[PDB]
Write a protein that binds this ligand. Sequence first.
Ligand SMILES: *[C@@H]1O[C@H](CO)[C@@H](O[C@@H]2O[C@H](CO)[C@@H](O[C@@H]3O[C@H](CO[C@H]4O[C@H](CO)[C@@H](O)[C@H](O)[C@@H]4O[C@H]4O[C@H](CO)[C@@H](O)[C@H](O)[C@@H]4O)[C@@H](O)[C@H](O[C@H]4O[C@H](CO)[C@@H](O)[C@H](O)[C@@H]4O)[C@@H]3O)[C@H](O)[C@H]2NC(C)=O)[C@H](O)[C@H]1NC(C)=O
Ligand SMILES: *[C@@H]1O[C@H](CO)[C@@H](O[C@@H]2O[C@H](CO)[C@@H](O)[C@H](O)[C@H]2NC(C)=O)[C@H](O)[C@H]1NC(C)=O
Ligand SMILES: OC[C@H]1O[C@@](CO)(O[C@H]2O[C@H](CO)[C@@H](O)[C@H](O)[C@H]2O)[C@@H](O)[C@@H]1O
Ligand SMILES: *[C@@H]1O[C@H](CO)[C@@H](O)[C@H](O)[C@H]1NC(C)=O
Ligand SMILES: [Zn+2]
Ligand SMILES: [Zn+2]
Ligand SMILES: [Zn+2]
Ligand SMILES: [Zn+2]
Length: 534
Amino acid sequence: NQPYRTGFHFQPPKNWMNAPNGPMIYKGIYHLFYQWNPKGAVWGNIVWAHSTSTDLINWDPHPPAIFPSAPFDINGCWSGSATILPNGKPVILYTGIDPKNQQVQNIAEPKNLSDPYLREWKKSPLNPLMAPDAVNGINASSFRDPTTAWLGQDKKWRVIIGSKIHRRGLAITYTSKDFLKWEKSPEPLHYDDGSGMWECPDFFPVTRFGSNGVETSSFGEPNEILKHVLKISLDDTKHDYYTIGTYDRVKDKFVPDNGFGTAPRYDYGKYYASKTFFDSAKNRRILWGWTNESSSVEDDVEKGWSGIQTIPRKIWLDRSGKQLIQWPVREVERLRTKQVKNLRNKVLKSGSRLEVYGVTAAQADVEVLFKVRDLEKADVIEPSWTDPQLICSKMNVSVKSGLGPFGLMVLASKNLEEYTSVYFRIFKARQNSNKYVVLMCSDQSRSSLKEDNDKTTYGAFVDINPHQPLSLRALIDHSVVESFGGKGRACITSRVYPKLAIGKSSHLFAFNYGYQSVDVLNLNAWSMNSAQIS
Ligand SMILES: *[C@@H]1O[C@H](CO)[C@@H](O[C@@H]2O[C@H](CO)[C@@H](O[C@@H]3O[C@H](CO[C@H]4O[C@H](CO)[C@@H](O)[C@H](O)[C@@H]4O[C@H]4O[C@H](CO)[C@@H](O)[C@H](O)[C@@H]4O)[C@@H](O)[C@H](O[C@H]4O[C@H](CO)[C@@H](O)[C@H](O)[C@@H]4O)[C@@H]3O)[C@H](O)[C@H]2NC(C)=O)[C@H](O)[C@H]1NC(C)=O
Ligand SMILES: *[C@@H]1O[C@H](CO)[C@@H](O[C@@H]2O[C@H](CO)[C@@H](O)[C@H](O)[C@H]2NC(C)=O)[C@H](O)[C@H]1NC(C)=O
Ligand SMILES: OC[C@H]1O[C@@](CO)(O[C@H]2O[C@H](CO)[C@@H](O)[C@H](O)[C@H]2O)[C@@H](O)[C@@H]1O
Ligand SMILES: *[C@@H]1O[C@H](CO)[C@@H](O)[C@H](O)[C@H]1NC(C)=O
Ligand SMILES: [Zn+2]
Ligand SMILES: [Zn+2]
Ligand SMILES: [Zn+2]
Ligand SMILES: [Zn+2]
């Protein structure tokens, strides 16, 4: 039996999964490739497994598309991206491991451009198109994950590749006139000292005002204003960070509008190796993200699988322009049951809980609107409290604040032996203005009776005004919780493995352990139907 397998998240029928690869749309069909281990449930024998969808929620399997077959990828087929050439033709740039264990860059073309499921791919004999050597002096063990490519004003292709010199992470830029002969730019698009290896770089334009995505190559009209995003996966910290900034076409350099570190993450919990693509069908940019297991490696081997992708999110620039907003693709809403469980104008007094009934609690979508009564009852933040994760760590739900904790017990046992808390605290900011600080925590210290699991607590700040009602959403899916505070302004994914709170035996609460009572304006819980995934 498989109590931890998800009913509506992407995962292979079995075995190991990590980074999402080459996502794209071709002929109105969504593709996902992914790092897969056909043999075991740990990392190894890494191939590009392949699935397709018409809605990003339901996925049909297909045989691996890119696996070791030539000198340029004999030892493995690591991450990479698909670019759509201006004639509609899709191509994949990916890292291969050559016979000398060097990380080289390889191209793949589809074999039959009339196959709408793009089943089979052909690799040029001219690969590697891009390799470390003695001239360029690139570290051969640190030259991976090409991005989607963007065509410049000079009709010349750009692509970046994640790397590092010493402790210096950088994005090595390559330019091409024809997409077959790539020459290394003398200059990195960007670099940061003391960061370490830059994995899974991503680089895409985003609109200054609007929710709609931007074609990756689009130019910044004097009448339509664009900003650029650079996303990196830091091998050392194991997190994804982005920075908003201007792309100087002349220099070919990314300049983050400081400050901009102190850098934002897409997701403040378990989330890594993320990658975007342009959904040309609906003009949105979609973000894919890998959430690995928090269980022991011992358990992965026993259950026979490891790793899932989050629900893919629509991503756009917030009005302030200081951060990105994410929100689960609207298609996942189709999985909702018809009978919505609703609760209005309820009062959660100090130390109270309110069970949501009549919803499959291990497989649900839930949205709360909290409202605080009197902001002047908020504790002033301690001057030293600047790391949101450490704040949530020290003050568990048992520690009372003026305002908070209030939020949700999810994947909870009847008598709360096991529960995962996704909650808020409100503070008054340490400055002359009447600014407030909203804290969002994902607490999984008491999420499972088995101690073996990674019970690390996650935290994020939310840029919303608590004069307004506080918004919280949670997608609950057996062993994964995806929490969104402030309508997508703060995202936290976590992985919990309850011993008691399983399937029919799991419950859903809204709670409040603050000193002050808070109002639940509105709460909606939908049971979530299963998806058709390989
Ligand atoms: C794939 O999944 C892997 C497992 O899920 C994952 O690796 C795991 O990563 C997490 C972090 O995301 C590791 O977290 C554990 O947390 C403890 C340290 O926490 C301290 O700092 C935290 C903030 O970073 C706070 O939340 C805590 O309060 C705590 O704070 C104390 O210390 C700080 C600074 O030192 C100080 O400021 C405070 O005052 C506090 O005193 C540790 O206890 C854990 O150590 C454990 O793991 C190692 C394994 O090598 C072993 O020594 C033991 O098992 C030990 O229990 C740990 O750091 C977690 O450990 C990781 N697990 C493993 C097996 O590596 C991996 O990141 C995922 N991959 C991707 C790509 O997402
Ligand atoms: C090139 O990058 C590689 C990959 O990170 C470096 O190898 C690691 O760092 C040192 C080697 O001096 C060792 O402590 C580790 O064993 C290596 N990492 C692992 C576990 O694979 C290498 O140092 C870099 N080379 C140079 C000269 O920059
Ligand atoms: O599967 C390889 C693929 O994964 C990434 C990002 O998830 O790197 C992971 O795997 C590497 C190969 O062992 C590790 O060195 C690295 O620490 C880990 O994050 C990509 O960089 C790579 O293309
Ligand atoms: C590719 O095009 C279509 C795929 O649907 C198929 O009818 C045809 O046989 C394929 N072409 C060949 C010969 O590979
Ligand atoms: Zn289908
Ligand atoms: Zn920087
Ligand atoms: Zn960390
Ligand atoms: Zn006020």
